[PDB]
Amino acid sequence: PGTVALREIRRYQKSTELLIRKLPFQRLVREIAQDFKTDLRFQSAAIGALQEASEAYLVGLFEDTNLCAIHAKRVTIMPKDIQLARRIRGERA
Amino acid sequence: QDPSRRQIQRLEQLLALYVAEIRRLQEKELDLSELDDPDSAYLQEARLKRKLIRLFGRLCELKDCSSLTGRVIEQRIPYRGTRYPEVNRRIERLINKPGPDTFPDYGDVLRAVEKAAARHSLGLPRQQLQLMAQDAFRDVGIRLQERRHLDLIYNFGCHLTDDYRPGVDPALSDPVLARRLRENRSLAMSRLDEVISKYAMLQDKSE
Amino acid sequence: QGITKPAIRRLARRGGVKRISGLIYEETRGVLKVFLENVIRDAVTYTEHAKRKTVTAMDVVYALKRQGRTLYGFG
């Protein structure tokens, strides 16, 4: 907090808080890059951005599904619920 | 208070070196093979960030200060939605529970409302309760989502992305790039819809 | 198999969902993969436009800014 701006620390902390393990995520991006016959490489920051945004997106999807679930007795979330929530709140991506 | 001063000087120096090395690692370009490697630059960056945060916490602990970094997601959400203060207090309590995973079900909110109304002994017409609870759950849930999203976009990326300006998108100029991006976008959307529907009709078949 | 049941469950909980269905796992993996595919396809387009060999985090940002409201408000 002398030579480092607090913003950067907030950022690194947030990186600490991700929910998907980083190695299998890496391997996922890897897989998609294989399927795309990509001749290219990815800078580590890009992978990071991908993961942050991806977990953001998934948690968002689930939030929307939660927000559309109104029942007298608590229900287990099933595919159809995701579908309907996505119709009501819209596709986030 | 001199050896302590020099100690915090050291720890802060180290914090800065950690930062510099993280900056360095973030810039590394990774081959398709590296993306399978357990010690790749991405994971090095990861563990380095971890140990950085640890050092930071140590410093806070050494400086009588708390380990908070002023995150938005830390900011207490207030709720004064219904004109029954006794319920507002309880809902506030619920949405600001300690934890990273304190996002409520509709059920949590309804239980809160029923509990408070029964405790503070008001006239609680059931249909009225259920409606009020549904509106509350929606309000509070929306705010929680907005907060997560702000927390995302405020602490997003790194120094490499910090210079983003929407109007410097080369796609605005180049019509070819814009066309490829257009076709791309249409595929993207139809693919997302494909999956959502796919699993929908799968659940349909199961039932 | 790569993205684990514990992780998917944890993501759902982060969003308020207490209980998910068996297919939710496979679906979350499918959704994640398609989303990633979309972001990637855009970024790769962006970086082949400027004749470069490596996919910059900026390419990913330009790409994400085109995935609906995903990074809505960033910038």
UniProtKB/Swiss-Prot annotation, chain A:
<dbReference type="GO" id="GO:0001556">
    <property type="term" value="P:oocyte maturation"/>
</dbReference>
<feature type="modified residue" description="N6-methyllysine; alternate">
    <location>
        <position position="22"/>
    </location>
</feature>
<dbReference type="GO" id="GO:0000939">
    <property type="term" value="C:inner kinetochore"/>
</dbReference>
<keyword id="KW-0158">Chromosome</keyword>
<dbReference type="GO" id="GO:0000781">
    <property type="term" value="C:chromosome, telomeric region"/>
</dbReference>
<feature type="modified residue" description="N6-(beta-hydroxybutyryl)lysine; alternate">
    <location>
        <position position="37"/>
    </location>
</feature>
<keyword id="KW-0539">Nucleus</keyword>
<dbReference type="GO" id="GO:0008283">
    <property type="term" value="P:cell population proliferation"/>
</dbReference>
<dbReference type="GO" id="GO:0007338">
    <property type="term" value="P:single fertilization"/>
</dbReference>
<dbReference type="GO" id="GO:0042692">
    <property type="term" value="P:muscle cell differentiation"/>
</dbReference>
<keyword id="KW-0013">ADP-ribosylation</keyword>
<feature type="modified residue" description="N6-acetyllysine; alternate">
    <location>
        <position position="73"/>
    </location>
</feature>
<feature type="modified residue" description="N6-succinyllysine; alternate">
    <location>
        <position position="14"/>
    </location>
</feature>
<keyword id="KW-0238">DNA-binding</keyword>
<dbReference type="GO" id="GO:0032200">
    <property type="term" value="P:telomere organization"/>
</dbReference>
From Swiss-Prot, chain B:
<comment type="similarity">
    <text>Belongs to the DAXX family.</text>
</comment>
<feature type="coiled-coil region">
    <location>
        <begin position="4"/>
        <end position="37"/>
    </location>
</feature>
<feature type="region of interest" description="Interaction with histone H3.3">
    <location>
        <begin position="4"/>
        <end position="207"/>
    </location>
</feature>
<comment type="function">
    <text>Transcription corepressor known to repress transcriptional potential of several sumoylated transcription factors. Down-regulates basal and activated transcription. Its transcription repressor activity is modulated by recruiting it to subnuclear compartments like the nucleolus or PML/POD/ND10 nuclear bodies through interactions with MCSR1 and PML, respectively. Seems to regulate transcription in PML/POD/ND10 nuclear bodies together with PML and may influence TNFRSF6-dependent apoptosis thereby. Inhibits transcriptional activation of PAX3 and ETS1 through direct protein-protein interactions.</text>
</comment>
<protein>
    <recommendedName>
        <fullName>Death domain-associated protein 6</fullName>
    </recommendedName>
</protein>
<comment type="subunit">
    <text>(Microbial infection) Interacts with human cytomegalovirus/HHV-5 tegument phosphoprotein pp71 and protein UL123.</text>
</comment>
<feature type="coiled-coil region">
    <location>
        <begin position="178"/>
        <end position="207"/>
    </location>
</feature>
<feature type="modified residue" description="Phosphoserine">
    <location>
        <position position="33"/>
    </location>
</feature>
<comment type="subunit">
    <text>Homomultimer. Interacts (via C-terminus) with TNFRSF6 (via death domain). Interacts with PAX5, SLC2A4/GLUT4, MAP3K5, TGFBR2, phosphorylated dimeric HSPB1/HSP27, CENPC, ETS1, sumoylated PML, UBE2I, MCRS1 and TP53. Interacts (via N-terminus) with HIPK2 and HIPK3. Interacts with HIPK1, which induces translocation from PML/POD/ND10 nuclear bodies to chromatin and enhances association with HDAC1. Interacts (non-phosphorylated) with PAX3, PAX7, DEK, HDAC1, HDAC2, HDAC3, acetylated histone H4 and histones H2A, H2B, H3, H3.3 and H4.</text>
</comment>
Swiss-Prot record, chain C:
<feature type="modified residue" description="N6-propionyllysine; alternate">
    <location>
        <position position="18"/>
    </location>
</feature>
<keyword id="KW-0597">Phosphoprotein</keyword>
<feature type="modified residue" description="Phosphotyrosine">
    <location>
        <position position="62"/>
    </location>
</feature>
<dbReference type="GO" id="GO:0005576">
    <property type="term" value="C:extracellular region"/>
</dbReference>
<feature type="modified residue" description="N6-acetyllysine; alternate">
    <location>
        <position position="65"/>
    </location>
</feature>
<dbReference type="GO" id="GO:0016020">
    <property type="term" value="C:membrane"/>
</dbReference>
<feature type="cross-link" description="Glycyl lysine isopeptide (Lys-Gly) (interchain with G-Cter in SUMO2); alternate">
    <location>
        <position position="53"/>
    </location>
</feature>
<keyword id="KW-0158">Chromosome</keyword>
<dbReference type="GO" id="GO:0070062">
    <property type="term" value="C:extracellular exosome"/>
</dbReference>
<feature type="modified residue" description="N6-(beta-hydroxybutyryl)lysine; alternate">
    <location>
        <position position="5"/>
    </location>
</feature>
<feature type="modified residue" description="N6-lactoyllysine; alternate">
    <location>
        <position position="5"/>
    </location>
</feature>
<comment type="subunit">
    <text>The nucleosome is a histone octamer containing two molecules each of H2A, H2B, H3 and H4 assembled in one H3-H4 heterotetramer and two H2A-H2B heterodimers. The octamer wraps approximately 147 bp of DNA. Found in a co-chaperone complex with DNJC9, MCM2 and histone H3.3-H4 dimers. Within the complex, interacts with DNJC9 (via C-terminus); the interaction is direct. Interacts with NASP; NASP is a histone chaperone that stabilizes and maintains a soluble pool of Histone H3-H4 dimers.</text>
</comment>
<feature type="modified residue" description="N6-(2-hydroxyisobutyryl)lysine; alternate">
    <location>
        <position position="18"/>
    </location>
</feature>
<feature type="modified residue" description="N6-(beta-hydroxybutyryl)lysine; alternate">
    <location>
        <position position="65"/>
    </location>
</feature>
<feature type="modified residue" description="N6-succinyllysine; alternate">
    <location>
        <position position="51"/>
    </location>
</feature>
